[PDB]
Amino acid sequence: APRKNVRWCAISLPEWSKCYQWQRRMRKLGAPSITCVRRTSVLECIRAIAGKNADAVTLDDGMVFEAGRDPYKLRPVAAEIYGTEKSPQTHYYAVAVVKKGSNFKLDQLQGQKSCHMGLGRSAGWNIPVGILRPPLSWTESAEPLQGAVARFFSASCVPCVDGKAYPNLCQLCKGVGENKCACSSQEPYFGYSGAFKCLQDGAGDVAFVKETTVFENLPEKADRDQYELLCLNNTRAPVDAFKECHLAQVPSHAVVARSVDGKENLIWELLRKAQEKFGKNKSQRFQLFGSPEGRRDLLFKDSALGFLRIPSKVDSALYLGSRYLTALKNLRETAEEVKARCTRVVWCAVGPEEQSKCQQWSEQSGQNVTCATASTTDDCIALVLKGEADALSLDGGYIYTAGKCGLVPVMAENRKSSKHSSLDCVLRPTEGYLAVAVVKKANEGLTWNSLKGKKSCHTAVDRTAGWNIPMGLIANQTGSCAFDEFFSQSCAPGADPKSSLCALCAGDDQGLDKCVPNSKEKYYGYTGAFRCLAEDVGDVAFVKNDTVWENTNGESSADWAKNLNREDFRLLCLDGTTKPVTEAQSCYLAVAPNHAVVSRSDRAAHVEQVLLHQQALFGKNGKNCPDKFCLFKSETKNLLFNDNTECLAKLGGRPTYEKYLGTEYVTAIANLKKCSTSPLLEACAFLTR
Ligand SMILES: [Fe+3]
Ligand SMILES: [Fe+3]
Question: Which domains are seen in the chain, by residue range?
Answer without folding.
Answer: 5-91+251-339 (3.40.190.10), 92-250 (3.40.190.10), 340-432+595-689 (3.40.190.10), 433-594 (3.40.190.10)
